[PDB]
């Protein structure tokens with residue numbers, strides 16, 4: 780009987796963990812573009828005159 | 830003229846090559862060498878000018 784009740788928790792917790800992992804991929808892809816712009820500004824404004 | 834955009838040094842030219850799912854750029858740059866020491870001045874004075 781406890782199998783049927785444990786599976787209901789397993790499904791929910793898996794859903795919640797996988798939602799967490801998707802939103803982190805989408806937030807990291809945005810931090811990546813900001814760091815790519817910072818790396819270009821360090822090259823073009825600090826080691827040069829733009 | 831963008832620094833570091835086309836390799837390290839003063840960009841002269843670039844050549845493309847194809848790769849399996851990409852591209853390889855060959856960057857030709859100028860790199861200065863064998864520097865010497867000198868004394869400098871902002872301006873010269875001559876005839877009060």
Ligand SMILES: *[C@@H]1O[C@H](CO)[C@@H](O[C@@H]2O[C@H](CO)[C@@H](O)[C@H](O)[C@H]2NC(C)=O)[C@H](O)[C@H]1NC(C)=O
Pocket residue numbers: 864865866
């Ligand atoms: C231009 O002159 C400076 C100062 O004279 C040189 O600096 C030397 O740097 C070395 C580092 O290895 C120090 O040990 C010396 O004390 C410095 N002074 C000297 C040698 O007088 C510098 O090397 C010179 N630049 C060039 C390109 O020759």
